[PDB]
Scaffold this active site. Sequence first.
Site, PDB file in Angstrom:
ATOM      1  N   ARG A 173      -2.074  -6.266 -11.666  1.00 52.57           N
ATOM      2  CA  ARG A 173      -1.540  -7.668 -11.671  1.00 52.57           C
ATOM      3  C   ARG A 173      -0.491  -7.954 -12.662  1.00 52.57           C
ATOM      4  NH1 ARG A 173      -6.960 -10.213  -9.051  1.00 52.57           N
ATOM      5  NH2 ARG A 173      -7.765  -8.631 -10.592  1.00 52.57           N
TER       6      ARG A 173
ATOM      7  N   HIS B 280      -1.576  -2.095  -6.678  1.00 53.76           N
ATOM      8  CA  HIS B 280      -0.943  -3.514  -6.291  1.00 53.76           C
ATOM      9  C   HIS B 280       0.344  -3.701  -5.921  1.00 53.76           C
ATOM     10  CE1 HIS B 280      -1.035  -7.864  -6.119  1.00 53.76           C
ATOM     11  NE2 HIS B 280      -0.144  -7.818  -7.341  1.00 53.76           N
TER      12      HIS B 280
ATOM     13  N   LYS C 251       1.406 -20.968   1.386  1.00 54.96           N
ATOM     14  CA  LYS C 251       1.072 -22.101   0.672  1.00 54.96           C
ATOM     15  C   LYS C 251       2.034 -22.748  -0.202  1.00 54.96           C
TER      16      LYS C 251
ATOM     17  N   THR D 166      -8.054 -16.728  -1.955  1.00 59.57           N
ATOM     18  CA  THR D 166      -6.940 -16.318  -0.954  1.00 59.57           C
ATOM     19  C   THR D 166      -7.554 -16.172   0.330  1.00 59.57           C
ATOM     20  OG1 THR D 166      -5.439 -15.491  -2.799  1.00 59.57           O
ATOM     21  CG2 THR D 166      -5.010 -14.502  -0.594  1.00 59.57           C
TER      22      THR D 166
HETATM   23  N1  LIG Z   1      -7.119  -9.659 -13.617  1.00 61.02           N
HETATM   24  C1  LIG Z   1      -6.361 -10.780 -13.055  1.00 61.02           C
HETATM   25  N2  LIG Z   1      -6.615 -11.576 -12.363  1.00 61.02           N
HETATM   26  C2  LIG Z   1      -6.076 -12.919 -11.941  1.00 61.02           C
HETATM   27  N3  LIG Z   1      -4.713 -12.917 -12.254  1.00 61.02           N
HETATM   28  C3  LIG Z   1      -3.940 -12.030 -12.871  1.00 61.02           C
HETATM   29  C4  LIG Z   1      -4.858 -10.885 -13.278  1.00 61.02           C
HETATM   30  N4  LIG Z   1      -3.985  -9.980 -13.886  1.00 61.02           N
HETATM   31  C5  LIG Z   1      -2.826 -10.665 -13.866  1.00 61.02           C
HETATM   32  N5  LIG Z   1      -2.607 -11.792 -13.406  1.00 61.02           N
HETATM   33  C6  LIG Z   1      -1.806 -12.696 -13.099  1.00 61.02           C
HETATM   34  O1  LIG Z   1      -1.342 -12.721 -11.616  1.00 61.02           O
HETATM   35  C7  LIG Z   1       0.005 -13.023 -11.610  1.00 61.02           C
HETATM   36  C8  LIG Z   1       0.922 -11.979 -10.827  1.00 61.02           C
HETATM   37  O2  LIG Z   1       0.224 -11.494  -9.527  1.00 61.02           O
HETATM   38  P1  LIG Z   1       0.971 -11.015  -8.511  1.00 61.02           P
HETATM   39  O3  LIG Z   1       0.114 -10.994  -7.270  1.00 61.02           O
HETATM   40  O4  LIG Z   1       1.678  -9.704  -8.710  1.00 61.02           O
HETATM   41  O5  LIG Z   1       2.057 -11.978  -8.105  1.00 61.02           O
HETATM   42  P2  LIG Z   1       2.037 -13.723  -7.915  1.00 61.02           P
HETATM   43  O6  LIG Z   1       2.002 -14.422  -9.199  1.00 61.02           O
HETATM   44  O7  LIG Z   1       2.626 -13.895  -6.817  1.00 61.02           O
HETATM   45  O8  LIG Z   1       0.409 -13.767  -7.359  1.00 61.02           O
HETATM   46  C9  LIG Z   1       0.519 -13.213 -13.276  1.00 61.02           C
HETATM   47  O9  LIG Z   1       0.491 -14.662 -13.319  1.00 61.02           O
HETATM   48  C10 LIG Z   1      -0.473 -12.573 -14.046  1.00 61.02           C
HETATM   49  O10 LIG Z   1      -0.632 -13.222 -15.221  1.00 61.02           O
HETATM   50  O1  LIG Z   2      -7.640 -15.039  -4.335  1.00 59.95           O
HETATM   51  P1  LIG Z   2      -8.238 -13.638  -5.166  1.00 59.95           P
HETATM   52  O2  LIG Z   2      -9.098 -13.084  -4.248  1.00 59.95           O
HETATM   53  O3  LIG Z   2      -8.766 -14.420  -6.393  1.00 59.95           O
HETATM   54  O4  LIG Z   2      -7.130 -12.702  -5.462  1.00 59.95           O
HETATM   55  C1  LIG Z   2      -6.761 -11.751  -4.544  1.00 59.95           C
HETATM   56  C2  LIG Z   2      -5.065 -11.669  -4.451  1.00 59.95           C
HETATM   57  O5  LIG Z   2      -4.510 -11.435  -5.771  1.00 59.95           O
HETATM   58  C3  LIG Z   2      -3.527 -10.526  -5.595  1.00 59.95           C
HETATM   59  O6  LIG Z   2      -2.216 -11.463  -5.167  1.00 59.95           O
HETATM   60  C4  LIG Z   2      -3.831  -9.795  -4.620  1.00 59.95           C
HETATM   61  O7  LIG Z   2      -2.595  -9.259  -3.740  1.00 59.95           O
HETATM   62  C5  LIG Z   2      -4.712 -10.684  -3.467  1.00 59.95           C
HETATM   63  O8  LIG Z   2      -3.672 -11.401  -2.551  1.00 59.95           O
END
Ligand SMILES: Nc1ncnc2c1ncn2[C@@H]1O[C@H](COP(=O)(O)OP(=O)(O)O)[C@@H](O)[C@H]1O
Ligand SMILES: O=P(O)(O)OC[C@H]1O[C@H](O)[C@H](O)[C@@H]1O
Lengths: 298, 299
Positions: free
Chosen positions: B95, B130, B193, B222
Amino acid sequence: STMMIFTGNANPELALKISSHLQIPIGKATVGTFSDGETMVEILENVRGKDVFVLQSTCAPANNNLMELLIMADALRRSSAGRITAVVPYFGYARQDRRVRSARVPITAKVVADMMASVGICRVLTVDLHADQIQGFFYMPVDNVYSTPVLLEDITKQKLNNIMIVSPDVGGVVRARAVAKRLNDAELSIIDKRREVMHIIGEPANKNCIIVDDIVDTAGTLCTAAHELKKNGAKSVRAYITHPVLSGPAVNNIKHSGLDEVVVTDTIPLSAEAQNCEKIRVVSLADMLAQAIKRVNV
Amino acid sequence: STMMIFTGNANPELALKISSHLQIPIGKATVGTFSDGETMVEILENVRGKDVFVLQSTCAPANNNLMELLIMADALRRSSAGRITAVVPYFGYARQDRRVRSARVPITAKVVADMMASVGICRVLTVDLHADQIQGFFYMPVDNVYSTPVLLEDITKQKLNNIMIVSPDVGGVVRARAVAKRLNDAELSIIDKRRSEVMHIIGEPANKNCIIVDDIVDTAGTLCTAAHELKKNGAKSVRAYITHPVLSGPAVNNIKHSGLDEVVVTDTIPLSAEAQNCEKIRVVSLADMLAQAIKRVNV
Ligand SMILES: Nc1ncnc2c1ncn2[C@@H]1O[C@H](COP(=O)(O)OP(=O)(O)O)[C@@H](O)[C@H]1O
Ligand SMILES: O=P(O)(O)OC[C@H]1O[C@H](O)[C@H](O)[C@@H]1O
Ligand SMILES: Nc1ncnc2c1ncn2[C@@H]1O[C@H](COP(=O)(O)OP(=O)(O)O)[C@@H](O)[C@H]1O
Ligand SMILES: Nc1ncnc2c1ncn2[C@@H]1O[C@H](COP(=O)(O)O)[C@@H](O)[C@H]1O
Ligand SMILES: Nc1ncnc2c1ncn2[C@@H]1O[C@H](COP(=O)(O)O)[C@@H](O)[C@H]1O
Ligand SMILES: O=P(O)(O)OC[C@H]1O[C@H](O)[C@H](O)[C@@H]1O
């Protein structure tokens, strides 16, 4: 002026002391974890063109403390820091610095050296590197500063006579001799374990013995060395050891040993249990590290 | 013949199931810690010239599980393994794969990709990455295998009518559509959302048996917010198929108190005891799928 300092979670107390000696505040940065435990970093300063020092020993928890350092460096690099220096007072994984007899093991210190290069770190500053040859694992400069002056100054305050410096194994003779040299060329003895059974090379009877080493980990050899020195008539036994790793039974081993005192530096913070152990006392390298940082700042 | 498999401590149960399917034993190796916690590895097999697969998700504890993988590779490389493949069913740090709006953050997924290259790994095999674009973080080949066939087989066993596939956020629509298209071309809805955070649905879930599809369930925020919005808008039932059960923090308790009929997850990440005690959570195995993918690349 160009200098900025950041710290991870490895040793915030030492970072605060270094900051006090440098008279510059610790830069703002989020260094923590996401909910799932993944290391989480955001730099909260403008660092463009700055001379940035990241203060982070890679003591336990080693991999988390290392990842914090590495992705702090990655964040700083893409944010156009002018220079990134890793100040790693205790360099974790330094004991895994070769394959003994070509065993099928990693050379983790080289893995780590390459990791630091891979994220754009420009220099390492460290204290009493377990093997000074680890300098050659790096293309970048590696400044290995010795703790001897601070340990020597504390030994002097004890106002001892009849001092004998003891190397607790055959690999620590160089570090032990460096202390003995500065104590009016004091006597030096070496512990030589065989088979099971430990032998002292030297005469400790009626001597104020001072064991010198770089790391106290389980304290097993430190305490068995102290017992054997006392069994051979030592007037007293103390230990001056740079890095207090103090894993597993170490604190209980020390508590129940014949050591008068174990003096360590603050490259690694003490656990709550070790802070409560009356035989363990900390002397600080914050001034020495601040001076080393000033010397490289440009 | 040339194949060997090793595993770290991330997910020994999956490693042993893969071993059972391949009908080759797990190679002997010490993978643990020294007394001070530093990662400790010794390979206890001759690996010279062998086609070696290291089975290790980088799930929590992520840095420890990653370090095991990296220095297992380092030990294998210096021991002259013929090839080293990292089988990382759940790819931790995926992520963190860009600097959103040029924020002063790391790109940790790229740090990790470079780490794997730096110790001599030759290929990565992973499940439901991901972002599939993480393939391009690597010079080496990256096989991103989809869990979809296993999840479709299980959905079919439920014999549900009036199915509606639901993406629980706007970034999951590609994955959700891929499942809907292969499931008798089912209808699709999207949860959207807005920080007004207020939920909105794109599509009509009323009277449908809704199936949420996603790659990771972490805190389950989520998932549970999507399940509540669907029920509020008249869904007949809600269940979820989510590949990687990260399940941090209050995830299990959130799921327990939700309206979800079931949450089906894979075994890329081991379940905690609490998750194992949650009747709503059920595991379907990717051991056979991963064994077949390993056989396909074995030289
Ligand atoms: N292990 C993690 N747990 C929660 N959030 C994370 C983690 N690693 C990265 N992120 C954060 O999640 C965001 C990107 O997630 P992604 O699903 O690719 O797009 P979105 O921001 O639309 O959710 C970035 O802000 C990043 O800092
Ligand atoms: O809401 P959480 O379970 O903490 O995070 C899971 C989501 O975080 C990332 O975007 C994945 O694609 C899922 O949609
Ligand atoms: N964190 C650690 N704790 C204890 N021992 C370690 C650690 N890391 C490596 N080792 C082991 O220590 C040995 C080398 O230590 P070193 O002090 O360099 O030489 P010596 O073995 O002569 O003391 C190797 O067998 C290595 O596997
Ligand atoms: N012939 C040798 N020359 C130099 N170092 C050695 C030799 N044999 C063993 N060592 C080192 O001594 C340690 C182990 O000692 P031993 O008990 O003799 O195997 C390891 O650090 C070895 O690398
Ligand atoms: N405190 C110390 N720790 C480790 N090595 C040292 C220390 N002091 C001196 N040495 C080494 O001992 C050797 C002799 O140098 P010197 O004793 O300073 O003339 C050199 O290789 C130094 O690097
Ligand atoms: O006996 P432990 O305290 O566990 O180990 C400490 C030793 O480990 C390393 O070789 C150091 O140089 C010390 O001599």
